[PDB]
Design a protein around this ligand. Structure first.
Ligand SMILES: Nc1ncnc2c1ncn2[C@@H]1O[C@H](COP(=O)(O)OP(=O)(O)O)[C@@H](O)[C@H]1O
Length: 758
């Protein structure tokens, strides 16, 4: 044809010869089954005997086991090998979902539908499925008429927007390394392609990527180019489909990374880009006269990334600034602040014997940082070692070396955070051009899933709270669609909103004197500590809220913990150490004041404009800003039609084609996929329009099938015969106004009788 000529088609759908070979395997619906297996998650076997509540099974490895029947899962026939939408399987169970995804992944078919979910398993290699010619194949095509692909989901959202006159959202989730960033970039490019009719808006949208990834992405153990911030990117269009504008919102930037690197990790890419040989004189202008290995804040672990050329990356970043209309002075002032950060991390201090007051231990690095900030080194060091506190008089407050080091790290994190916020805001101004009406938008949300670590803190609480909200959002969306379908089919049975399954945990976190409220209140109580917070939380909730628990003893390498919560993804042990400090984000106000007075670095003055000093003043916690931000995100998502992309990391080795079955099953458990298949299975997983049912099953009831001119009455007549024959129960189906609805396993049984009689 023409589809089959494109190189991407072999990575989208098997040939007829590969399919017939897939379907050419021995199979007995009553013999071949799946059993639990520690290594492989599930293992194929054959029932050789059955005895009451038990079954004897020879597994694929040859051994013989005896199991309770409740552990045995039905295996799908080979005609369902590599099925494109798993809600079509005859048997909707965990073992079959795992098998189908693994079979597709082995053939580098990385996209699979699962009803409302689009699952994508990271290929860890280049696939030719994202080219212009591949994208054009999906434009205007019915999603059900094309193989699974990110572009089919994207094009359906775009057509929905135009035909339904409603905003859309694309929610992309998954663990670190699963593929979120890559999918997000390709979605944005697809929308910029379909919405495009001497520097175009589309060009500038794309150029945000090098800038935002230089300052917001870093090498981690899990991912060489890990985005350390969540993001919501809205692509605005007029009512004719024309690209109009784009805006970006960022969430939870990882601030600790600019002062600390764990083994195997790097700081944000930008420091190594600036230092690279792309612009050799830049190091000299920035007074970066030591090897990069000697700058403590960026050199605690790795300095290079296998496969990444920081020279070429910096060229792309430096050019992107220009394309995005940053001025030469803005760009240089930005680079100077990055230099200042590296110099600050190398400043040393000491105390003389029996002195509590820190003094500089040499001043060369402080002078270089001050030069980058455009301020005097003496006032900078005085602000740092002897800050002033208003109490109606300015008093000087002494600092020891521990306090100075704390203050330097806090300043460096808060200054970097504000540079990043400024880069986003500047991008947003560039991308907001005159010309095209902003009638609708599609919002792309890319943020990490649940995080359950050995040690869970304030940052994990917020990301897990976010994901409770997002999973409830999915559950509610699924519930509304089911309810609306039954309603218009005249089959309404009354069921409770699936989103209520997450509401108790959400309330524990978000209600008055729930977790966040108690933190906000305690953070301002004189003499309060992390321990008084924790006792208050236990006092308010333990034994009164079922999702609040005392934590298990530190098994394995779990740290100490003050309380535990039962999240959607499991039980999380939280440690409240430093939560009061994290919630207030205190800075050295005297240092900020000196920076806001700088005459040598206008960008430095700009990025502190959101901060009010003591002198300017003469309360908003972090969680209050986060709560407002999340509430605004959710209010907006609930005024859109959402689409769901679930990225899966296949293994821990960045190995293409290899599946770690335990790791994959765990993600499918925690990301809603397996629970969605269960909920599907327990309802009416299958629906067939009356005419197609009549043609499908006439042979089982040929007189009934032709008994009436009205196709609905013919379908009813067939079903009445099956119920009369005993080969169907009235409970197993429902006749709708336009479709027949089938409980789990009922359609397959009807296929069995149809094939037998055939
Ligand atoms: N669809 C894909 N095609 C090619 N490579 C991919 C794809 N998805 C992920 N990768 C690879 O895996 C790495 C991690 O993916 P990424 O999207 O950065 O994960 P996440 O953003 O979820 O942390 C990428 O840098 C890239 O090498």
């Amino acid at each position: 044809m023409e589809h089959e000529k494109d190189p991407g088609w072999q990575y989208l759908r098997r040939t007829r010869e590969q399919v017939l070979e897939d379907q050419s395997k021995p199979y007995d619906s009553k013999k071949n089954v799946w059993i639990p297996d520690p290594e492989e998650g599930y293992l194929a076997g054959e029932i050789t005997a059955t005895k009451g509540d038990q079954v004897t099974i020879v597994t694929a490895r040859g051994n013989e086991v005896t199991l309770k029947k409740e552990l045995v899962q039905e295996m799908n026939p080979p005609k369902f090998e590599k099925t494109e939408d798993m809600s079509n399987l005859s048997f909707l169970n965990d073992a079959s979902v795992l098998h189908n995804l693994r079979s597709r992944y082995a053939a580098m078919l990385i996209y699979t539908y699962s009803g409302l979910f689009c699952v994508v398993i990271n290929p860890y290699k280049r696939l030719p499925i994202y080219t212009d010619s591949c994208a054009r194949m999906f434009m205007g095509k019915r999603k059900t008429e094309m193989p699974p692909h990110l572009f089919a989901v994207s094009d359906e959202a775009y057509r929905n927007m135009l035909q339904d006159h409603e905003n859309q959202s694309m929610l992309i989730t998954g663990e670190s390394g699963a593929g979120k960033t890559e999918n997000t970039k390709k979605v944005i490019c697809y929308f910029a392609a379909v919405g495009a009719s001497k520097v175009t808006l589309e060009d500038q949208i794309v150029q945000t990527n090098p800038v935002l990834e230089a300052f917001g992405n870093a090498k981690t153990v899990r991912n060489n180019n890990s985005s350390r911030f969540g993001k919501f990117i809205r692509i605005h269009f007029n009512k004719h489909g024309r690209l109009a504008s784009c805006d970006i919102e960022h969430y939870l930037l990882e601030k600790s990374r600019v002062i600390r690197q764990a083994p195997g990790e790097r700081c944000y890419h930008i420091f190594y880009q600036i230092y690279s040989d792309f612009r050799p004189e830049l190091k000299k202008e920035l007074l970066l006269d030591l090897p990069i290995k000697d700058y403590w804040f960026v050199a605690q672990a790795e300095l290079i990334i296998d496969g990444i050329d920081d020279v070429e990356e910096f060229q792309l970043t430096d050019e992107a600034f220009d394309i995005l209309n940053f001025s030469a002075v803005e760009k240089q002032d930005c680079y100077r602040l990055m230099s200042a950060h590296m110099h600050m991390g190398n400043m040393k201090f000491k105390q003389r014997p029996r002195e509590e007051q820190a003094e500089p231990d040499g001043t060369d690095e402080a002078e270089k940082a001050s030069n980058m900030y455009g301020i005097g080194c003496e006032e900078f060091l005085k602000a740092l070692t002897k800050p002033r506190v208003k109490v109606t008089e300015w008093v000087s407050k002494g600092q020891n070396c521990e306090q100075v080091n704390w203050a330097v790290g806090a300043m460096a994190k808060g200054l970097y955070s504000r540079v990043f916020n400024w880069l986003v805001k500047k991008c947003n101004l560039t991308l907001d051009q005159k010309g095209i009406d902003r009638d609708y938008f599609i919002g792309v949300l890319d943020i990490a899933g649940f995080e359950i670590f050995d040690f869970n803190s304030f940052e994990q609480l917020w990301i897990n709270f976010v994901n409770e909200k997002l999973q409830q959002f999915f559950n509610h969306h699924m519930f509304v669609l089911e309810q609306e379908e039954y309603a218009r089919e005249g089959i309404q049975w009354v069921f409770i909103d699936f989103g209520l399954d997450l509401q108790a945990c959400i309330e524990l976190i978000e209600k008055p004197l729930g977790i966040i409220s108690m933190l906000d209140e305690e953070c301002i109580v004189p003499k309060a500590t992390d321990l008084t917070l924790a006792s208050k939380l236990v006092d308010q909730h333990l034994g009164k809220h079922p999702n609040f628990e005392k934590p298990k003893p530190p098994k394995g390498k779990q740290g100490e913990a003050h309380f535990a919560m039962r999240h959607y993804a499991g039980t999380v042990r939280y440690n409240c150490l430093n939560w009061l400090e994290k919630n207030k984000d205190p800075l050295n106000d005297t240092v900020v004041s000196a920076m806001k007075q700088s005459k040598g670095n206008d960008l430095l003055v700009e990025i502190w404009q959101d901060y009010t000093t003591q002198e300017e003043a003469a309360f908003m916690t972090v969680s209050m800003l986060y709560r407002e931000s999340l509430n605004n995100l959710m209010t907006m998502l609930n005024k859109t039609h959402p689409h769901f992309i679930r990225c899966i990391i296949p293994n821990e080795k960045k190995q293409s084609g290899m599946i770690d079955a335990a790791l994959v099953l765990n993600q499918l458990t925690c990301n809603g996929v397996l629970e969605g298949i269960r909920i599907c299975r327990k309802g009416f997983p299958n629906r067939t329009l009356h005419p197609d049912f009549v043609q499908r099953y006439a042979i089982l009831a040929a007189k009934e099938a032709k008994s009436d001119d009205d196709k609905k009455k013919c379908a009813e007549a067939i079903m009445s015969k099956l119920v009369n024959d005993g080969s169907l129960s009235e409970e197993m189906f429902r006749i709708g106004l336009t479709k027949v609805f089938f409980k789990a396993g009922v359609l397959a049984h009807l296929e069995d009788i149809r094939d037998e009689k055939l």
